[PDB]
Amino acid sequence: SSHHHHHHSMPDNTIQWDKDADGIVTLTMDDPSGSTNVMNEAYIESMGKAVDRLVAEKDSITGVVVASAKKTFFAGGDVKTMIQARPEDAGDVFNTVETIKRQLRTLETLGKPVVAAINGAALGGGLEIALACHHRIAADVKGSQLGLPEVTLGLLPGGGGVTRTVRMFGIQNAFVSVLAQGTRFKPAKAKEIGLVDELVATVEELVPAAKAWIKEELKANPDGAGVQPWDKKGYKMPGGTPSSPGLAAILPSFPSNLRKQLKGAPMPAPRAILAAAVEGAQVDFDTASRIESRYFASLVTGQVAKNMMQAFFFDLQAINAGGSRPEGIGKTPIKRIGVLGAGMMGAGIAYVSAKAGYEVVLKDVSLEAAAKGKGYSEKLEAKALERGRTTQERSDALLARITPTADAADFKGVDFVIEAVFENQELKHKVFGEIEDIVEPNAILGSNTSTLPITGLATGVKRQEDFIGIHFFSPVDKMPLVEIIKGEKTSDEALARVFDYTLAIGKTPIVVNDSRGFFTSRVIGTFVNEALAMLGEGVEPASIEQAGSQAGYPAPPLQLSDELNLELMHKIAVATRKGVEDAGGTYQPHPAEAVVEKMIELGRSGRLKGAGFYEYADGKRSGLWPGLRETFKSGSSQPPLQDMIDRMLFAEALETQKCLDEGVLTSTADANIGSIMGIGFPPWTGGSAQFIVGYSGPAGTGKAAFVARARELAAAYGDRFLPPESLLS
Amino acid sequence: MSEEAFIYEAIRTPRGKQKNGSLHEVKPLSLVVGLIDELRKRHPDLDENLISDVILGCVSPVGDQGGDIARAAVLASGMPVTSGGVQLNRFCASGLEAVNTAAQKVRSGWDDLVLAGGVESMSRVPMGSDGGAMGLDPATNYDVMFVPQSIGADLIATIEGFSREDVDAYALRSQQKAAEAWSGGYFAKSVVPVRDQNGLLILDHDEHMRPDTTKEGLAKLKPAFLAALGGFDDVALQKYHWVEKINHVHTGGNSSGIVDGAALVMIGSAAAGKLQGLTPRARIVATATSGADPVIMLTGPTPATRKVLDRAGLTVDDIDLFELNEAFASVVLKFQKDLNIPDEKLNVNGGAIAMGHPLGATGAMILGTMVDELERRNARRALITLCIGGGMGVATIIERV
Amino acid sequence: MSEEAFIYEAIRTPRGKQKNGSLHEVKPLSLVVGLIDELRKRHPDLDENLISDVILGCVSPVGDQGGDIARAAVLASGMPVTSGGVQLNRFCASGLEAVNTAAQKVRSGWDDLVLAGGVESMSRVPMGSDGGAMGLDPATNYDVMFVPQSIGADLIATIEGFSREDVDAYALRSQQKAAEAWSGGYFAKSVVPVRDQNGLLILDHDEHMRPDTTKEGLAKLKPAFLAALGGFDDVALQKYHWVEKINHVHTGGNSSGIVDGAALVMIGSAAAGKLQGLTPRARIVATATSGADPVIMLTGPTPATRKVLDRAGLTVDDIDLFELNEAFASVVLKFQKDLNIPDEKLNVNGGAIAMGHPLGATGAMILGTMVDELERRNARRALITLCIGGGMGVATIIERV
């Protein structure tokens, strides 16, 4: 009954008021406590005053223009408040989004045209504000995005995004195209799907074009001015309402399809979005909006959203702000990069460095292979030119920066070295030692190795202070994580210079101290090894794959075990066994090693051979090997599926805490984003380190319940599940 | 528990097929009124004021079948205005549930004579026309793993090792036994031909039957393609995670047929029969309602049969005839395999694969089918059960008198 | 009478009004699950596997209320998959019919513990949404002389000499007694407030109530405006040829309110309650189903009440409380005049004129209302009856225990 949060018994003011001679009110959003407009408590009171004033002066107002003084139009909500919302705060969260939406509903039913002047990024609640307007004009400036990405934080568009997008596009289109995955759209595609009505070239035209549309809308469409399509007498929802016979014939398949694409993972945000969309399409707009509020509060007060908000908002900001970057180091720009190795990785490394605008000298043995890595980078442009994204002016400049060569002396003037030659220490020493004195003395000397320690590799150069590990993931052009590895001789300046390089190419960095398996390769090993152990114990392989998919992983472990060569995992085992045996300790074999050697004994080393846990045909993965159940006598051991899930998740979570105890990692944020972007740890957990503080089961929720469940698993399946003392008291 | 419930009449209409069927022009209300008039013809001096209720099962009580079609049948047929009228929906067992509820109302001593049965004009009111709380609410559909009945039958065949030839072999068996039942004249008295307002014949036989079905003809059919929409296979395997791939063996030739039909049973106490000059034909021995996992919705007949066998104090060997609805061939083979049912006792006059499955009426149709066959064989006991959507099950034991 | 039917719990939701109602955003499936969860709260150690059926009345079983909403409630609430679930429709007595059928299934001995009640979200599924086998068939509508209930009510007032002030005087009595019952705390234990998934309150009272109603305000109201469609007055007077003109005395203030609500009753045998530690609150003495003229559609309670009194060997003097649904004021004044019901015994805690008439749930709502009022007064017997569309009638006698 109020546009305000409090109506009994002093925040900032973030909205300017301009009413011109023609009665057009220009609401200009400008939060003085930041550079981004956000749905904080200050906005709610500021917009609450303006909407009160819009109603009181309605006899003198002809139209409304919503604009922003910042570079961005409006970006997201108050995450610092939503992450603190306890279950007993659900009423407060419910009342907050109801107040926000009552403001937008009044602005929407003002009887006057309202236009959104989208000058920049309109994300989350920002697009929801623009959706409350009757017309959306967007400037086609670069760096601008539009969408409702609150599903990525475990939330839902609770400021009318669900309700309004369903009214505009229908249940199916709004869910698939906009809501379920929180896709961000450039202004041209935002206009294509219908999120934006007009496009202009610059921000200067926006407010004059919005006012010109208002003046024109009143003349041509006077009775329909300021009336959304769903507020008209004969509104018909696109695709129909749930009562429509056409939609009712396919409606029962919407949850099952969603359960397919999610593979059964416990991610409650897409489920609630689909529920709020269908239940909202059954009733009037206002009732649909209040149903949307209750589902929003159900997510905010849940643990899964507190995991995702911690990972994809706070942890990501701390990483991009330089939390692992060494303290007090200036920037050292990069003039010319030099890539030693034109293989699968070095091709993408040379591409992502050229796409960022850096001169790259790509070296390989032959000029044939020196241009096979560049041919990899033409396959991505010829596919980005066909998809109508980039231009032939930009693409011809990108491929021109990539210089293929086999001349070692061509590394003259190269200040950044990324080596992607094969896993051979004598080879990396060879390639580096033949280049150290031709490249600058100020030059970084990075290595993309995944197993060989940086400490031993650094002893091939004179300036070991400049040697560092720059570990990309395949394929380089898509994987976002860069695992920067700090060797014993690595300087802080070299660590910071590579940290700056990773951000300059649009990737996310984590800092790792040199150790066997580093962090990503080591943690993911416990995941695939835990599954192979279950296979040896007699668990059905179909159940193991189902456990990995329902746990939230992007690929089931036996399938992933075929992609990574089984003789590659066997080599990592022998490499680690020699490391422990040389140190004097006895190497206790993981129960998965007997499964690896049994499969290699049967000539089923994985996908490369065409035979592994799955059978393969014409390069396409077929079904699971029928002889697998007779080999390991599967079906004789049938533990609960939740135990198989927890056995894989806890194995990685415990190995993450061990990495933190050993000093392999510096922060929990580097562990969460490292596990999410690097090895595919389920995003609903918020990372392998957040999984400890956010575990939820029959034992409870928190670190203590994690410890209790880990011991419950330990007594049943092995002492590797016993928690480190750092999690105890 | 005091009053014994007896079956005095058990009749049904012929079953008209889905596409260009003879009964498509007949409103389902008329299908029931005709059966009411047939009861009046068999008993001209029946005091209909002694009838206290009319209970009809109907799975899609919408449109032609909405507004309590049982009450509409009471009024349209000119039955006394005190004779009740109530519709119920328990999915595929609604027809048998109406008979059981009628029997249980008689046993309570508070009802004397009741008409029970069902009606389903699937050519006019398709399945799912009534919507559905589970199907149309995503939150319920997500929590309760919703899956069509066809996917459950394929999952049964996969887990039990029922090959495509095994289920088609049963489908061939149902066509043969249904054709032999009509040829022998088993259905001559209980199948009441449907006629128009002028007395002209509309349908006098089960036109869904394909009595010349061959093993070769069944092998050439194609699997079912609510199914043919994405998601349902992955959802079933998420619960049944030890199963890797579902073997889709069910076609239109080994599944129940979409048909129109109605059935009506006259149930009353012994005093109601003696007072109205009605000869009892069978006694309702016991009823049971149970069920199994709502993803494998069609395994419900097994616990419901054990439950009714426990109450009646009987075993499998004491039952002369087993009648299970042929919704899908794998369901019957699973039921036969579990309880070791002899093959010469199971669905001896064919089932819904040949004659059709009019959802709301099938339970009362196959019940009266066993009342006739117990008389014709001069046998003693029969057990009737049907699988149900949502994972339910209903079973009934009758005893010839 | 070997197995007696006992009422162990009888709960209901508050009734939310039709326009701007608090329960409009609540799925009717959710209304039943909330009552199921309340029964779990009152009996945390209840073996729900002993529950063999859930029986819900629903007059508009379509859309949110289609697809056997009783089974939907079983699966959505996490009850055992053996717990049954069947929807029935006997128009306005569907809620009481579900309780009667549950009691009769218990007495039959083939059911042990059954949940019974009803649900009707009239603001989401309006009356007539399911279509109708009568109105859809002109030949049948033309034959049965279909006349809506409100016109039958106005016809009762004209024949019996009930004035506009007379029917408004009873409506004032209903508002006052409902307000006195709420203020006295009579409904505190049985009215279960509805809450959202976050636990936030949605509705905790019967918001259709107008406690400050006056006789002058009722007179300013206008008569009801389907009955507004032409011909119904002339059709009714063709049947009742001795009445020259129908006095339209009924308005929205002296007729039942259109509301959303749900009710749920737990019924079982003495052995079933002893097994689960349930204390019996009342006993079902007898049930009866009768009917009256189908054009007046509302005089069904009188023969049904007499039929249940004869069945139990009782008379009006043996009954402490009479609970007749307040579909229309003239219906209750007619029932009171015929059976000479004392005013102090009739609808003592108010009725549907004040609190509303959720079609499928009302019968179970007013039954539990008498269960509580018998305990509160320490009285013995209450008779509960509802008029039914099509001129039917259902009556139940309960005895405090």
Ligand SMILES: NC(=O)c1ccc[n+]([C@@H]2O[C@H](COP(=O)([O-])OP(=O)(O)OC[C@H]3O[C@@H](n4cnc5c(N)ncnc54)[C@H](O)[C@@H]3O)[C@@H](O)[C@H]2O)c1
């Ligand atoms: N393959 C992966 O998925 C993956 C993942 C993480 C890290 N890595 C690391 O990446 C490196 C391999 O990169 P890749 O997969 O693109 O290589 P690749 O498998 O394509 O290796 C073949 C390349 O080695 C080159 N080569 C051999 N001797 C050379 C020399 N003296 N100088 C220059 N090039 C020489 C060949 O010319 C060709 O460019 C290794 O250090 C590996 O551990 C790989």
